[PDB]
């Protein structure tokens, strides 16, 4: 018998991104080669199968720094982290291959699917 | 030039509620008279002006237990915590006054507004 506030989930996500921008209660640093990204573990886990597996591990759940594979492109990771916090994906000809590879690694299927579609359309 | 995944924010919220149900990475207990509720500080802060003020305080941000005013109804708090994590509000004739009072205390304006509307319609 519940009523539902349509904009609630998007407002929560906007507010989580505002906390990230102000560095409020961020609890992990993701390191991608020479670059560092501060984030909230729960948001990473709610978006990515890889982060869900990492932060449910009894030892890794306690880590404050996670180093990604050196093959991962920092710009590709930045674009996906922004997508996690905003639902918006800055997909461009110049970054699509790095974004797709990063989304495969992070196990973000919806992103992998749109990248495949955009690549197929250019063929 | 971004593309947007429409269902992303709702999927994130569903996944945060799945983490709450399994008690994964919950970092605070809210105590309401004899009742305890485990939650994630970032979700509380993203939904409630009161929790935003609490967890941005330099001393209270470190607390693992927060005790609410004894006047707050635990069922009213449970309904609002479920709304935070799902966008669904279980508003009923038998709970509307407790829900409205709890939403005023938690500074959740959209909930206060719908309660006022439902009360006014019954007059």
């Amino acid at each position: 018998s519940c009523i539902q506030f349509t904009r609630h989930a998007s407002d929560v996500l906007l507010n989580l991104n505002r906390l990230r921008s102000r560095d409020i209660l961020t609890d992990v640093v993701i390191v991608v080669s020479r670059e560092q990204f501060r984030a909230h573990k729960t948001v990473l886990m709610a978006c990515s199968g890889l982060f869900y597996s990492i932060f449910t591990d009894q030892l890794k759940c306690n880590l404050s720094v996670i180093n990604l594979d050196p093959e991962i492109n920092p710009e590709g990771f930045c674009i996906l982290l922004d997508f996690m916090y905003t639902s918006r994906l800055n997909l461009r000809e110049g970054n699509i291959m790095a974004v797709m590879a990063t989304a495969m690694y992070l196990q973000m299927e919806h992103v992998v699917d749109t990248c495949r579609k955009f690549i197929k359309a250019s063929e | 030039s971004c593309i947007q995944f429409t269902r992303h924010a709702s999927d994130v919220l569903l996944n945060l509620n799945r983490l709450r149900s399994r008690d994964i990475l919950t970092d605070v207990v809210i105590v309401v008279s004899r009742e305890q509720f485990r939650a994630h500080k970032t979700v509380l802060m993203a939904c409630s002006g009161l929790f935003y003020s609490i967890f941005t305080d330099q001393l209270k941000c470190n607390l693992s237990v927060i005790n609410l005013d004894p006047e707050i109804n635990p069922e009213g708090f449970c309904i609002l915590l479920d709304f935070m994590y799902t966008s669904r509000l279980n508003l009923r004739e038998g709970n509307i006054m407790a829900v409205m009072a709890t939403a005023m205390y938690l500074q959740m304006e959209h909930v206060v507004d719908t309660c006022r509307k439902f009360i006014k319609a019954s007059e």
Binding site: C2, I3, Q4, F5, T6, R7 | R88, L89, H110
Partner: peptide, 5 residues
């Protein structure tokens, strides 16, 4: 906003 889901 509010709707019947």
């Amino acid at each position: 906003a509010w709707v019947i889901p």
